[PDB]
């Protein structure tokens, strides 16, 4: 049933979930992976299929930007991800997981659930700002709207995207800046939580939702604690043109790095 499954996914975290999928079946969505393995490589828009997605709604039944991705995979990967998460649990930049085994049809399929991710990961912001195409920019309108950079009528302007006819677009993009900068800070906590726990892995962009949290421990192998390494070659590098389109460091010219406080003199 898709109702006992929902009442399991809600868990102990008192959240009210509307299934974006349909009937305990995975929701196939078109996303922006950054991937390298023995067959494929690149920063490309693939199509992910292994994740049931439920959206949480607040009081008065309004949908907020907070989802519950419930990725289902093999039992061995579930066990490995459970031990890696129980090492990295104490970190604050790690989205809260929930590991359960549920009767899907006649068998216990192991689901690992991730709580309160946003809709689009950082790779979707970076891909939609790096691979711009003004006919088809719908994961940039939705990111700009849903994080209050503009107000969904800004796109009724004739050329809202144009840096030379509409220079005000820079003020729009800079309103993403503090959402990006906090993301950077959360990475440096997560990298630290890897280094002090002895976990070796590759930080990709698409494993970080736009709040900042990190949520994929599939190919992290653990070594002796105090000596793990994070590999952030292709995290910081793909992200790099976004750190000045969106002016991510203009909260650093303010005293004690708070956007409310006055400038440093
Ligand atoms: C340069 C970097 C580290 C060099 C080093 O000196 N490590 C010290 C730790 C020793 N170990 C191998 C254990 C290299 C070598 C070892 C790592 C790759 C391995 O395929 C294992 C790893 C786990 C998954 O299963 C498959 C992929 C992973 C993520 C790869 C990523 C990357 O390419 C790493 C971090
Ligand atoms: N064929 C598959 N079906 C489902 N899950 C898989 C498959 N191959 C790998 N995985 C697991 O999913 C991860 C990649 O899934 P992905 O689509 O990136 O979702 P997420 O970003 O949540 O990991 C890998 O780390 C691995 O643990
Ligand atoms: Mg992943």
From Swiss-Prot:
Domain NiRAN stretches: 5-259
Cofactor (UniProt): Mg(2+)
Residues engaged in binding Mn(2+): 207, 216
Reactions that this protein is recorded to catalyse: RNA(n) + a ribonucleoside 5'-triphosphate = RNA(n+1) + diphosphate; a 5'-end diphospho-ribonucleoside in mRNA + GTP + H(+) = a 5'-end (5'-triphosphoguanosine)-ribonucleoside in mRNA + diphosphate
Mechanisms controlling activity: Inhibited by Remdesivir antiviral drug (GS-5734) through non-obligate RNA chain termination.
UniProt repeat feature LRR, residue ranges: 197-222
Primary role: RNA-directed RNA polymerase that catalyzes the transcription of viral genomic and subgenomic RNAs. Acts in complex with nsp7 and nsp8 to transcribe both the minus and positive strands of genomic RNA. The kinase-like NiRAN domain of NSP12 attaches one or more nucleotides to the amino terminus of NSP9, forming a covalent RNA-protein intermediate that serves as transcription/replication primer.
Oligomeric and partner information: Interacts with nsp7 and nsp8 to form the replication-transcription complex (RTC): nsp12, nsp7, two subunits of nsp8, and up to two subunits of nsp13. Interacts with nsp9.
Protein name as annotated: RNA-directed RNA polymerase nsp12
Organism: Severe acute respiratory syndrome coronavirus 2
């Amino acid at each position: 049933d898709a109702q006992s499954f929902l009442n399991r996914v809600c868990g102990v975290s008192a959240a009210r979930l509307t299934p974006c999928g349909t009937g305990t079946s995975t929701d196939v969505v078109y996303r922006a992976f950054d991937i390298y393995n023995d067959k494929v490589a690149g920063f490309a828009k693939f199509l992910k299929t292994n994740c049931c997605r439920f959206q949480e709604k607040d009081e008065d039944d309004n949908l907020i930007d907070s989802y519950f991705v419930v990725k289902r995979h093999t039992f061995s990967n579930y066990q490995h991800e459970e031990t890696i998460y129980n090492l990295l649990k104490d970190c604050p930049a790690v989205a809260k997981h929930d590991f359960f085994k549920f009767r899907i049809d006649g068998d216990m399929v192991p689901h690992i659930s991730r709580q309160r991710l946003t809709k689009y990961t950082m790779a979707d912001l970076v891909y939609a700002l790096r691979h711009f195409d003004e006919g088809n920019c719908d994961t940039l309108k939705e990111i700009l709207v849903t994080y209050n950079c503009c107000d969904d009528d800004y796109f009724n302007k004739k050329d809202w995207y144009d840096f030379v006819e509409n220079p005000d677009i820079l003020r729009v993009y800079a309103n993403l800046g503090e959402r990006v900068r906090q993301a950077l800070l959360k990475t440096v906590q997560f990298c630290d939580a890897m280094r002090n726990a002895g976990i070796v892995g590759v930080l990709t962009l698409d494993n970080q939702d736009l709040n900042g949290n990190w949520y994929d421990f599939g190919d992290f192998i653990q070594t002796t604690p105090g000596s793990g390494v994070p590999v952030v070659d292709s995290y910081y590098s793909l992200l790099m043109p976004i750190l000045t389109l969106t002016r991510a460091l203009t909260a650093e010219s303010h005293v004690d790095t708070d956007l409310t406080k006055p400038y440093i003199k």
